[PDB]
Design an enzyme around this catalytic site. Structure first.
Site, PDB file in Angstrom:
ATOM      1  N   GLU A   1       5.188  10.430   0.462  1.00 15.32           N
ATOM      2  CA  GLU A   1       4.637   9.101   0.248  1.00 15.32           C
ATOM      3  C   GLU A   1       5.628   8.026   0.679  1.00 15.32           C
ATOM      4  OE1 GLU A   1       5.438   9.336  -4.204  1.00 15.32           O
ATOM      5  OE2 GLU A   1       4.456   7.378  -4.077  1.00 15.32           O
ATOM      6  N   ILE A   2       5.086   6.877   1.083  1.00 11.12           N
ATOM      7  CA  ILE A   2       5.879   5.710   1.436  1.00 11.12           C
ATOM      8  C   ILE A   2       5.069   4.469   1.091  1.00 11.12           C
ATOM      9  CG2 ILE A   2       5.222   5.048   3.787  1.00 11.12           C
ATOM     10  CD1 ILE A   2       8.371   5.376   4.356  1.00 11.12           C
TER      11      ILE A   2
ATOM     12  N   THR B   1       0.831  -1.193   0.000  1.00 14.02           N
ATOM     13  CA  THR B   1       0.000   0.000   0.000  1.00 14.02           C
ATOM     14  C   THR B   1       0.868   1.247   0.000  1.00 14.02           C
ATOM     15  OG1 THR B   1      -1.442  -1.276   1.459  1.00 14.02           O
ATOM     16  CG2 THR B   1      -2.068   0.991   0.995  1.00 14.02           C
ATOM     17  N   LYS B   2       0.435   2.259  -0.747  1.00 16.89           N
ATOM     18  CA  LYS B   2       1.030   3.582  -0.640  1.00 16.89           C
ATOM     19  C   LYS B   2       0.385   4.330   0.517  1.00 16.89           C
ATOM     20  CE  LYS B   2       0.331   7.320  -3.626  1.00 16.89           C
ATOM     21  NZ  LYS B   2       0.424   7.582  -5.088  1.00 16.89           N
ATOM     22  N   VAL B   3       1.205   4.776   1.464  1.00 14.88           N
ATOM     23  CA  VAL B   3       0.729   5.465   2.654  1.00 14.88           C
ATOM     24  C   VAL B   3       1.475   6.783   2.783  1.00 14.88           C
ATOM     25  CG1 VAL B   3       0.585   5.417   5.160  1.00 14.88           C
ATOM     26  CG2 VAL B   3       0.073   3.359   3.844  1.00 14.88           C
TER      27      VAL B   3
END
Ligand SMILES: [Zn+2]
Lengths: 166, 87, 96, 147, 20, 58, 356, 49, 110
Positions: free
Chosen positions: H45-46, H9-11
RNA sequence: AAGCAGAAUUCGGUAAGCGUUGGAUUGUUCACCCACUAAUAGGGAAAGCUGGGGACCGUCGUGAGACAGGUUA
RNA sequence: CCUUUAGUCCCUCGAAAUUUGAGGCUAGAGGAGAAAAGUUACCACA
RNA sequence: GACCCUGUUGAGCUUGACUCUAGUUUGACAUUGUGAAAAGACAUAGGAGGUGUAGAAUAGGUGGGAGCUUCGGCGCCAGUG
């Protein structure tokens, strides 16, 4: 594949009869009732309608079936509940004219009319579960036993109705 | 305009988010032998394109997105949303 | 070229000499592998010429156009050591 | 013609990117190396290898055309017909080889849709057509069939 | 490995394998 | 099991699907039950259908 | 007119002809039922009357409609692995690694591969430029399987303009022997030379001759292959000009040249051969005036040759009788191929053995 | 998703970043944030696997 | 594109209406003609966009003011020609919009 | 001026008197979203700061480049 | 020696039967000499 | 930078006579025998045969042929060709 649906409401079917040809029957996962691939003729355009019915028990591929009010009262044709006479087995019947078939689609059920009501036209139909219903005479229905068989293993007994039973 | 912006144009991907999955796959080979992948958001479709070129043969990749997606070979595309139990 | 000629050598030499060559080709198959694997697979045989046994040069012979058939005589060799030696080579080939 | 097409339907890499790939190896760049052909062109095949004579004339994608509005003089009508080959550009023999479409250029077009009956009873599949406009100024090709 | 072990001269005496 | 064919008239029918039978001689397909082409119950109502059709026509 | 209306009439006319005994009209004969089938097939599928009636006489009604349906749809792309360089398993695997969907073309060829789609141009792939496969047609495979050439023979290919068949003989000959590749066209010969060098063939001579001069030129070949130029009634999908540009004049000159070519092939071969004196005649046409009529002519004017079993696995037997034409009974060994039956081009193979 | 599956997931990095990481901890066995080089260094983003 | 998009989006989508309003509009405005009219507007909107893309590419290779001016006139002239073909659909939609603006507000479920 | 009932508008005319914003630019692209406001129009004087993103000979070879070899605005 | 042009429907060869194709004839056009020569709105260098 | 030209080079096109002949190559024939075992084609005398589609049906083909008849079946005629 495609849902089993009737032809759309139109003047030609509600007042005449239309000829159609079936090509093959296809089995699909999720149910035991075999779908029937049928091709019809458009009364207005030079085009063929691709619609799918449910193959009843006993029919084959290659009938010139008749679709309308005055069609032949044979297995493989459909007919409004007004025209078909008393005691006849009907399958895949319409609750209302336009729903393209709602009642009795599982593999082997059928509906037998037990009385017609002429004035304010209504037709009485018995459900497979033993229920009694009244539906408009203008509705349609597939004549015959829907294919699938296997009706020797249905246990019909209730704890309460047995106490109700004489 | 960026280094990955230009190099993605020459490689033919739809966005530079394709490379994000590429380096992620290099670090962790989850996109290896395993067959089924579910892409819950592919607005351009870059992640679907990256999958369409590195999965084992006869794999399944399905991607959903609210916006329309131009069809990508060997990829299933959905017009439905994600926050609905119809989806 | 030497692998094919060495199986021919192993056919007609004393038991210990045949065993020594058999062990040698076990190492050759192990160290190189895919360079000589097509010699024992008929589908991977080259079809760009005919094998020339009595060539004057190593490259003159076309050794990837032939197949090692000598295993069918060395499997029935009188020396148990040779038979175990042959089985050693195929075990390495099957593990390639 | 449109109805016939409607029923029938119901029934590589660019030269510029090749130049970028090649010039990458040859780091030293000679001044004026690239010759961008700024005239409209017709090529045909998606990928081809050119002789070293013409491997320096680059024809951009945006200037390429594949069809033309071709008018039949006898049967007074015009139909969009695909272009098959460029036969002669009466301004430069190099332009003919490069496929440059200028005014007065003879091109060969596919006239199968029109259905012209020859003296032998066959249906014509290809005829000459002369470009009657300026495709560089007007973003299209207009031609009159030589029949 | 095997090639070196069989290459030593003391492998080929002539001892019969019935008189072990 | 092997069943008889109405059209081709010979014993050349086999089961293909849950309720689909097929004969490869004339390439005709039967729409029947899970294990039998014609159910005894299906025969009775067709006979009843024929009898009422005679009654209606008479 | 209304094209979908024509399709309905086409289907309606066919079923009537199938069951004319019971389903007919008041007094119209089946003669004008077929004639009605002629016009609407011509108007719908874009054929002229001469070829359409010719094709309709070849087949019966419901098979004919399948033939006209097959001609419009394209054919699958098939590639032939070069045995001189690799075998099928790697070339399949090598192209799979590049993004090409491959299956074997069938159980009848250990060399052909079928392609669905690819993400790279199939004619520019590195193993293509290495000479590992050539784009060919499945019908082109058949003549060389009938004419199987062994090593150390002399072969004559009388029309090798594309080059797929000549390369196949070289692969089966393992680059041994001599192959005479001949094209009467210089323009098309350049492509054959390029194909030969790309595919690594060393035992060929490319000559630009008319094929009727060959016994005069050299003669004595062990095996001679003849793909006669023809109308192209089996390659209609690639060449739509056949549908309307083939009349009675064309169908009279073409069999004459083909008959002259076949006699040249017979005289070119060597009856007293240590390995074989086989002649294979092939055609990409379905018409009988170009198949089994040229074959009958060869057997009736050269009583020193005999038809032998063709050897291909699949196919349909040749025609023994036609519109008043009685052929030699041995013609049943010749084979035919149709797009609707097998997904290959319309084709015809014949194989001869020389005995004197 | 099957036992042993992988979820990525991009978190965006924020004060809810740690609260979401606790969910994969109680629902999965191995967790890690990557931030591949293609993601802009300015971006917050991470990517969590 | 903005003006075309406003027309397409402003008119009601017959599929999403209540059955009473869907049928009433079919009798009033010949729903088949309504779909045909909107399709031509959508078709013309896409065609103008492709014309703009095509001539921007040409302008980037133009070599003088005269050539640039001719391409701009060609791009604008073709956009004008397409709108002139929309004459019959636009007359139909204006009449429908005026009729729709005057329709009574009937609550289907009340 | 317009089915412009009211409200809200749309197209056009005279008009430059008076104004024409605060953020993001931290995910993707034809780079353009968040709002606030009466509105968030376009240009000329064509301009400076700030971030992004050389040419001649000589030698050894040329299916082709190499040189911490020389000179210079 | 082949190929094109127009002609008598003048002869031969092959094919199909209720017609063709290729040669042959009449006179226009294409093809000092294994040393090298000519030529190009093309390429590279000067 | 682009334009025209020259020299060298590369890519390409054209020419590079005719008559015998070395070399090379294809086909037929000759030496040149005797046997044996097979295969093919020629000689008779027999036997058995014809299924593309449509046609009820397995139509070698060619000629007469509207009547033949183990006296009840065929014919013709209508088809289909
Ligand atoms: Zn049957």
């Amino acid at each position: 594949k495609a849902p089993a649906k009737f032809r759309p409401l139109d003047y030609a079917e509600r007042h005449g009869y239309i000829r159609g040809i079936v090509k093959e029957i296809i089995h699909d996962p999720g149910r035991g009732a075999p779908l029937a691939r049928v091709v019809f003729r458009s009364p207005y355009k030079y085009k063929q309608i691709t619609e799918t019915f449910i193959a009843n028990e006993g029919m084959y591929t290659g009938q010139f079936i008749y679709a309308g009010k005055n069609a032949a009262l044979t297995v493989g044709n459909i007919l409004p509940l007004s025209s078909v006479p008393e005691g006849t087995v009907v399958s895949n019947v319409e609750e209302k004219p336009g729903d393209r078939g709602a009642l009795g689609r599982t593999s082997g059920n059928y509906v037998t009319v037990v009385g017609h009501n002429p004035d304010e036209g209504k037709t009485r139909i018995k459900l497979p579960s033993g229920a009694k219903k009244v539906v408009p005479s203008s509705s349609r229905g597939m004549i015959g036993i829907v294919a699938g068989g296997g009706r020797t293993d249905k246990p019909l007994l209730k704890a309460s109705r047995a106490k109700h039973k004489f | 305009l960026d280094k990955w912006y230009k190099l993605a144009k020459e490689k033919g991907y739809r966005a530079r988010a394709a490379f994000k999955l590429i380096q992620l796959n290099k670090k962790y080979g989850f996109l290896e032998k395993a067959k089924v992948v579910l892409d819950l958001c592919a607005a351009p479709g870059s992640w679907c394109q990256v999958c369409a070129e590195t999965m084992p043969k006869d794999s399944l990749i399905i991607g959903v997105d609210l916006a329309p997606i131009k069809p990508i070979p060997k990829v299933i595309t959905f017009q439905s949303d994600i926050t609905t139990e119809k989806c | 070229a030497f692998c094919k000629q060495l199986m021919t050598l192993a056919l007609q030499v004393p038991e210990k000499s045949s065993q020594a060559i058999l062990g040698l080709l076990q190492d050759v198959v192990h160290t190189h592998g895919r360079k000589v694997a097509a010699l024992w697979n008929t589908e991977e045989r080259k079809g760009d010429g005919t094998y020339k046994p009595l060539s004057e040069t190593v490259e003159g012979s076309n050794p990837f156009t032939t197949t090692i058939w000598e295993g069918e005589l060395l499997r029935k060799h009188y020396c148990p050591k040779v038979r175990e030696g042959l089985k050693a080579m195929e075990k390495e080939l099957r593990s390639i | 013609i449109k109805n016939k097409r409607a029923e029938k339907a119901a029934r590589g890499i660019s030269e510029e990117e090749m130049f970028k790939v090649v010039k990458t190896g040859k780091k030293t760049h000679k001044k004026g190396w690239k010759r961008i052909v700024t005239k409209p062109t017709f090529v045909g095949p998606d990928f081809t290898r050119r002789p070293v004579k013409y491997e320096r004339f680059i024809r951009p994608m945006g200037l390429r055309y594949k069809k033309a509005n071709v008018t039949h003089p006898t049967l007074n009508v015009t139909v969009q017909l695909p272009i098959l080959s460029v036969k002669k550009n009466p301004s430069n023999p190099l332009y003919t080889q490069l496929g440059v479409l200028t005014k007065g250029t003879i091109i060969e077009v596919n006239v199968s849709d029109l259905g012209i009956v020859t003296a032998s009873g066959k249906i014509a599949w290809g005829r000459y057509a002369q470009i009657t406009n300026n495709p560089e100024n007007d973003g299209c090709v207009n031609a009159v069939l030589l029949v | 490995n095997k090639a070196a072990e069989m290459s030593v001269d003391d492998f080929f005496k002539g001892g019969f394998e019935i008189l072990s | 099991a092997r069943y008889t064919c109405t059209f081709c008239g010979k014993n050349s029918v086999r089961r293909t699907a849950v309720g689909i039978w097929s004969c490869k001689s004339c390439k005709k397909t039967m729409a029947g039950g899970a294990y039998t082409v014609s159910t005894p119950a299906a025969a009775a109502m067709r006979s009843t259908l024929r009898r009422l059709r005679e009654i209606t026509e008479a | 007119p209304d094209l979908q209306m024509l399709r309905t009439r086409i289907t309606d006319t066919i079923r009537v002809l199938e069951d004319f005994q019971n389903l007919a009209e008041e007094g119209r004969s089946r003669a004008e039922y077929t004639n009605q089938l002629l016009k609407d097939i011509c108007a719908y599928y874009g054929y002229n009357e001469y070829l359409a009636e010719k094709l309709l006489n070849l087949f019966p009604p419901r098979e004919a409609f399948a033939f006209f349906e097959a001609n419009e749809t394209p054919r699958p792309v098939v590639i032939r692995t070069n045995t001189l360089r690799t075998h099928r398993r790697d070339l399949a695997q090598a192209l799979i690694n590049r993004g090409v969907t491959l299956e074997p073309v069938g159980k009848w060829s250990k060399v052909g591969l079928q392609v669905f789609d690819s993400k790279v141009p199939l004619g520019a792939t590195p193993e293509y430029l290495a000479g590992h496969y050539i784009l060919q047609a499945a019908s082109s495979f058949l003549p060389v399987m009938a004419l199987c050439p062994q090593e150390n023979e002399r072969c004559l290919d009388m029309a090798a303009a594309p080059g797929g068949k000549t390369t196949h003989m070289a692969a089966l000959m393992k680059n041994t022997g001599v192959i005479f590749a001949n094209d009467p066209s210089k323009s098309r010969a350049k492509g054959l030379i390029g194909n030969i060098h790309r595919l690594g063939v060393r035992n060929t001579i490319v000559c630009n001759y008319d094929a009727r001069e060959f016994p005069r030129v050299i003669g004595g070949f062990d095996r001679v292959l003849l793909d006669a130029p023809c109308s192209g009634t089996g390659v209609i999908c690639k060449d739509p000009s056949v549908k309307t540009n083939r009349d009675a004049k064309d169908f009279m000159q073409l069999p004459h040249t083909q008959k002259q070519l076949l006699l040249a092939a017979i005289d070119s071969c060597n009856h007293a051969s240590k390995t074989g004196g086989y002649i294979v005649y092939s055609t990409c046409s379905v018409c009988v005036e170009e198949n089994e009529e040229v074959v009958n002519y060869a057997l009736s004017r050269r009583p020193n040759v005999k038809l032998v079993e063709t050897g291909l696995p699949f196919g349909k037997e040749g025609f023994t009788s036609y519109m008043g034409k009685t052929f030699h009974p041995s013609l049943k060994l010749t084979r035919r191929f149709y797009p609707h039956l097998y997904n290959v081009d319309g084709f015809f193979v014949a194989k001869f053995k020389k005995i004197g | 998703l099957i036992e042993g599956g992988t979820f990525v997931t991009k978190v965006f990095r924020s004060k809810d970043y740690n609260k979401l990481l606790w969910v994969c901890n109680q629902l999965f066995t191995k967790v890690e944030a990557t931030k591949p080089p293609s993601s802009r260094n300015v971006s917050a983003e991470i990517f969590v696997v | 594109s903005e003006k075309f998009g406003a027309i397409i989006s402003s008119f009601p989508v017959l599929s999403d209406q209540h059955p009473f309003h869907r049928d009433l509009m079919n009798i009033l405005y010949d729903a088949d003609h309504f779909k045909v009219a909107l399709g031509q507007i959508s078709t013309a909107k896409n065609l103008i966009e492709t014309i703009s893309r095509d001539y921007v590419r040409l302008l980037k290779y133009a070599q003088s003011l005269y050539q640039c001016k001719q391409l701009k006139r060609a791009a604008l002239g073709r956009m004008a020609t397409l709108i002139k073909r929309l004459k019959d659909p636009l007359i139909y939609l204006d009449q429908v919009r005026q009729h729709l603006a005057r329709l009574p507000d009937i609550n289907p479920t009340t």
